[PDB]
Write a protein that binds this ligand. Structure first.
Ligand code: ZZL
Length: 256
């Protein structure tokens, strides 16, 4: 695999630590997304074990709702990451443009996530980094999990918003950590922003540690219940996916 097997299209993103361009595999005209990385910024951060370890995990996962990593290859000074391309764009931007999502749209995204996660929780992998900007949209408008920068094996410093008390209180945690994010996320899908939002890192900790959230009046009781069930402080109180997938509100509003 050489960078000359591909035809770079329009840029879709920037980082940290390279760029993501549209691209067409020359011989098969196969459309995809290609992530670039400079070995320079790589060792300058030393996170090379992660890249190898993250690419490691993602490369061995199969799900309609999990963005696929076909392959990769490095050259003179670059690292190349051959990724599945998501036509409809990023869920984050969408939320930005619409402000929030009606119950039907929210309820379905959750159902798709629940499966993708139910799946990960059986391959013994925990995402832990579920957040809008980690979600993209398939051409059919369906949800796709994109990043694995953290996702680890278990039972086992950035944005504190989607992390549960255990993660934050440096405590011992497991697969139920993702069920807390699903709650937070659900809330954001419906409210327009996270439950434990704060102008300061410090005070978010407090809001999250003490599980302090309230709903806007417009939030329906069907939702409030689910979210509340999902945002239980004690990881054991956190329901299990099946139950989530089979919650009244979920069923009464989902497409799947
Ligand atoms: O603006 C539009 O109209 C638009 C934007 C994007 C798409 N599609 C798309 N499909 C697949 C990927 C990406 N984007 C993508 C794009 C940019 C960047 Cl900075 C990262 C990635 C990723 C990614 C990743 F590796 C880690 C974490 C998150 C990721 F999102 N990986 C594949 C369609 C339309």
């Amino acid at each position: 695999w050489a960078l000359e097997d591909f035809e770079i299209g329009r840029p879709l993103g920037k980082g940290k630590f390279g760029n993501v361009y549209l691209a067409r595999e020359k011989q098969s005209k196969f459309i995809l997304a290609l992530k670039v990385l400079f070995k320079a910024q790589l060792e300058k951060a030393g996170v090379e074990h992660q890249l190898r370890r993250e690419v490691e995990i993602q490369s061995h996962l199969r799900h309609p709702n999990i963005l696929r990593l076909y392959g990769y290859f490095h050259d003179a000074t670059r690292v190349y990451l051959i990724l599945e391309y998501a036509p409809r764009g990023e869920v984050y931007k969408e939320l930005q443009k619409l402000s929030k999502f009606d119950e039907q749209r929210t309820a379905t995204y959750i159902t798709e996530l629940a499966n993708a996660l139910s799946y990960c929780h059986s391959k013994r992998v925990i995402h832990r980094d579920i957040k809008p900007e980690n979600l993209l949209l398939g051409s059919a408008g369906e949800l796709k999990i994109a990043d694995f920068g953290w996702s680890v094996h278990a039972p086992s410093c950035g944005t504190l918003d989607y992390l549960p008390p255990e993660m934050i209180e440096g405590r011992m945690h497991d697969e139920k950590v993702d069920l807390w994010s699903l709650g937070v996320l659900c809330y954001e899908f419906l409210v327009g922003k996270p439950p434990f939002e704060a102008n300061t890192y410090q005070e978010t900790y407090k809001r999250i540690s003490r599980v302090e959230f309230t709903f806007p009046d417009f939030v329906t009781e069907g939702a409030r219940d689910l979210i509340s069930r999902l945002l239980k402080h004690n990881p054991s109180q956190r329901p299990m996916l099946r139950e989530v997938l089979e919650h009244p509100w979920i069923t009464a509003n989902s497409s799947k």
